[PDB]
Chain A
């Protein structure tokens, strides 16, 4: 059990939680594993709540401090002075060393950490108009996510992943004979309590 998202400004620090239920909290190791967007799995270090012992990967020896709240049955990882290279996902993991219960590996949901100075900006929704592909360009928003539909629906649609404020595209394609029927792209940015439904016209 871990929170899903944390915002944290550049050069600030974050204290990530991992509540453990359903086993002897002081009998296993809890691990930390870092995944950057679309890249691999790095093991940051771990802690043995029952005895307080720690390990840190050399690549994190001075960035991270693991500590444990025996009372809450919770572990904490604290990273120092966050850069952009630090924006990533942080899984916590129970796994066994040895043999007797070898397949015991169990992962937290993870925590998406974004590092930004930005503020909740609304989004601009621009239409893309010319057997025919249409489109919306959702530009300059923060935070994530937005969610685009076309009523719906539903098929032939490609909602792309946001890129950097944030900005995504979304293509719908439809039979050409259908240019006399209304096609509208429905953006929603939950954090700016904004909802835009832009008719695509020529």
Chain B
């Protein structure tokens, strides 16, 4: 059976959370594939189905529990289970469509949304954008409950989509970036709750192509520089992978390591 990693919002501390994200990174990749000091997620090609997903079980103070499903290849959420029902983001292809039939094999009810799980569609179905949707142990607490109650008609679509945006950023993107993991770390210490600033949004949007640029780079140097944004929304280019080592923590597999 797939590995499970547990996290409650109930009594969460900086350490309780950090452990979770570091545990998630550990089961996402073996860490044998490292380019320029940055780990690589497993290559989708040739990967046994029994190593394709990990499971993340989130619980909260309200004594509710959901289990999300992450794709090791992307570190992104593909669906979740809540009691007797599993819901899945629409697969972009027939390989993915078959893969999720290996998930939560023992549930009574399985459904597939018409919509993908990319930010673009979810923002639409939520009415908010990522920069309008607060993140924090509070918003996470609320996301766990909304997802739980969607099975029982008690959760409306905009709130469901919005809760996804909360989960995906605090789990997937936090695993992908040490920067974003920190931004959630600060929100837990000083007990804050706030939307991500442009430094975060920019990274999430750029994760795939940062991954490409680092892997197809020349001894670290980007072929073309990549523009990001600071917290204050100012724009700056990145020319080399060195500035990113304390920032990106996982890359998607793009190419075999060069000599």
Give A residues with C-beta under 8 Å from B: 27-29, 48, 50-53, 55, 96-99
Which residues of chain B from 37 to 96 have any CB-CB distance to chain A below 8 Å in the complex? Answer: 44-46, 49, 91, 93-95
Task: Give the residues from 74 to 130 in chain B that come closer than 8 angstroms, CB to CB, to chain A.
Answer: 91, 93-95, 97-98, 101, 112
Contacts A55-B49, A97-B101: A50 and B112 contacting too (C-beta < 8 A)?
A: no
Q: CA A53 – CA B94 in complex, angstroms?
A: 12
Closest to B101 in A: A97
> Apart from A96-B94, A97-B94, what 11 extra A-B contacts exist at CB < 8 Å?
A27-B93, A27-B94, A28-B94, A29-B94, A48-B94, A48-B95, A50-B95, A52-B45, A53-B95, A96-B97, A98-B97
Chain B residues lying within 8 Å of A48, measured Cβ to Cβ, are: 94-95, 98
Ordered by A's residue number, 16 sampled pairs between the chains whose C-beta atoms are within 8 Å are A27-B94, A29-B94, A48-B95, A50-B95, A51-B45, A51-B95, A52-B46, A53-B49, A53-B95, A53-B98, A55-B49, A96-B94, A96-B97, A97-B94, A97-B97, A97-B101
- Measured CB to CB, the closest approach of chain B to A132, in angstroms, equals 61
Main secondary structure on A side of the interface with B = loop
The distance in angstroms between the C-alpha atoms of A12 and B101, with both chains bound, is: 35
Number of A-B residue pairs at CB separation under 8 A: 29
Number of interface residues of B (CB under 8 A): 12
- Whether the Cβ atoms of B98 and A97 lie closer than 8 Å is yes
Q: How many Å from the CB of B69 to the closest CB on chain A?
A: 16
B237–chain A nearest beta-carbon distance, Å: 35
B74 → A minimal CB distance (Å)? 15
Closest A residue to B100 by CB, please name it: A97
| A51 partner residues in chain B, CB cutoff 8 A | 44-45, 95
Please name all residues of chain A whose beta carbon is closer than 8 Å to the beta carbon of B101 when the two chains form the complex: 97
For A98, the chain B residues whose CB sits under 8 A away are 91, 94, 97, 112
Query: Which residue of A is nearest B93, CB measured?
Result: A27
Q: How far is the CB of B99 from chain A (nearest CB, A)?
A: 8
Pick the most buried of A51, A55, A97: most chain B CB atoms within 10 A of its CB.
A97
Tell me the minimal C-beta distance from A100 to chain B in angstroms. Answer: 9
- Tell me how far the C-beta of B114 lies from the nearest C-beta in chain A, rounded to whole angstroms: 8
Docked pose: A51 CA to B45 CA in angstroms: 6
Taking the closest CB of chain B, its distance from the CB of A169, in whole angstroms, is: 48
How distant is the Cα of A27 from the Cα of B93 in the complex, in angstroms? 8
Output the least CB separation between A116 and chain B (Å): 37
Q: How far is the CB of A57 from chain B (nearest CB, A)?
A: 14
Are B112 and A29 within 8 A (Cβ)?
Answer: no
Most buried by A among B44, B46, B91, B98: B98
List A contacts of B98 (CB < 8 A): 29, 48, 53, 97
- Most chain A CB within 10 A, of B44, B49, B97, B112, is at B97
Q: Please, which residues of chain B bring their CB within 8 A of the CB of A52? A: 45-46
Most buried by B among A29, A98, A99: A98
